[PDB]
Design a protein around this ligand. Structure first.
Ligand code: TOR
Ligand code: ZN
Length: 257
């Protein structure tokens, strides 16, 4: 099945998932001098006070921190969004080295990693229905650079030893995702897709301008994770990012000048 290696990676995905070459694929390079400032965009509203985290899972591609999405406990609204989008999970993509790892790029710059907070449009009732709709998901993307430690990330880093291999999960309750955000909510936005198979074209991308800083020790612990399952030969979980895809017939809007 699919992965990020030479024989099953992004270059191969189109065979099982021909949408890989479709009209609104993600990620993309954000050319900052082509994006259009849109003064009509309302501020982003990130409401995570009642967020209820549940469990963390190594899924053999990255790791998911899952949330209780049975009520409007943690929602994203405003910006380019119509209505209410409920937080369901977050995960990251990262590199083998600090100079690569992000999925989106900014003027061709690759960050060390990228955080994705995934939300679904409540008008569609559940996540599985939402992914079948052109406005089904909103994914909030945040770049990571290596510098000072991110205190709000440490609880995540601390638990990775217990989910080293594919299929392993651990209890991950009472985690506050607000600790993962930068100060500024300035953003770029464009219509795109899931960046992994089945690559469904259901995502409003909201990518924050301001990266968060994480320490070298924090990112190093991400890179000790394994793609393989327990007892199998070790394949380090690194470079689990899809490269930039053609922008095609799309416009990236900016919340800021
Ligand atoms: C851990 C990783 C890489 O991300 C998880 C899961 C399956 O892929 C995802 C990708 O979400 S994304 N990158 O489009 O926000 O698609 C969903 C189903 C949203 O879950 C995401 O594997
Ligand atoms: Zn992702």
């Amino acid at each position: 099945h699919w992965g990020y290696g030479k024989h099953n990676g992004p270059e191969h995905w189109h065979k099982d998932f021909p949408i890989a070459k479709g009209e609104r694929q993600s990620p993309v390079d954000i050319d900052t001098h082509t994006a259009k400032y849109d003064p009509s965009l309302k501020p982003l509203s990130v409401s995570y006070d009642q967020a209820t985290s549940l469990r963390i899972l190594n899924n053999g591609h990255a790791f998911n921190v899952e949330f209780d999405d049975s009520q409007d406990k943690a929602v994203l609204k405003g910006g380019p969004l119509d209505g209410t989008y409920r937080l369901i999970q977050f995960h990251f993509h990262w590199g083998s080295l600090d100079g690569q790892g992000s999925e989106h790029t900014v003027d061709k710059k690759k960050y060390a990693a990228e955080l994705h907070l995934v939300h679904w449009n409540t008008k569609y009732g559940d996540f599985g229905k939402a992914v079948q709709q052109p406005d089904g998901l909103a994914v909030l993307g945040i770049f990571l650079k290596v510098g000072s430690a991110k205190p709000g990330l440490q609880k995540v880093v601390d638990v990775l030893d217990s989910i080293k291999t594919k299929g392993k999960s651990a209890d991950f309750t009472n985690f506050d995702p607000r600790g993962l955000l930068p100060e500024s909510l300035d953003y770029w936005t464009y219509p795109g897709s899931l960046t992994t198979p089945p690559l469904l074209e259901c995502v409003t991308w909201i990518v924050l301008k301001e990266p968060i800083s994480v320490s070298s020790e924090q990112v190093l612990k991400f890179r000790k994770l394994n793609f393989n399952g327990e007892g199998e030969p070790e394949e380090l979980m690194v470079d689990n990012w899809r490269p930039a895809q053609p922008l095609k017939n799309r416009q990236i809007k900016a919340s800021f000048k």
